[PDB]
Amino acid sequence: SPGTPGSRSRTPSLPTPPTREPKKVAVVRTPPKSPSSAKSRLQTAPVPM
């Protein structure tokens, strides 16, 4: 007997489309900034002359 039987899957292969890469790695842009504000402040005179 043939030692690899017919009981076994013989599914024939297909036209699979071409392979895309795993990762894009497109270029980044820096995020924007404005400068930090002082939190403790200068104050005016509460009392006049």
Add this chain to the structure above:
Amino acid sequence: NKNSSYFVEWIPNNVKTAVCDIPPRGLKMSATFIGNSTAIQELFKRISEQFTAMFRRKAFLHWYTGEGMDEMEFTEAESNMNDLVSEYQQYQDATADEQGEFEEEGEEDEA
């Protein structure tokens, strides 16, 4: 450290210990070992080859079929013992690698 090549590298760390507090009869301490090496592939590669050395010539085969067997039963079982050698071949000399094969970022410089 002394034997690093004789581990499989995709099984990083390979040892399982147990310690019983009691010796056997005799000396103060002993230790039982159980190994699983692909080395045993050289047990199956022998018997399949000596099976092949009987099977074509069919020698003795009439006593096996005589008690009940078909030739297909021998032919799936030697083929089994070939498939098991190919399992050790899959699992010998393979490396530490990721989940599946993957493609790296190339050279594309043309401009």
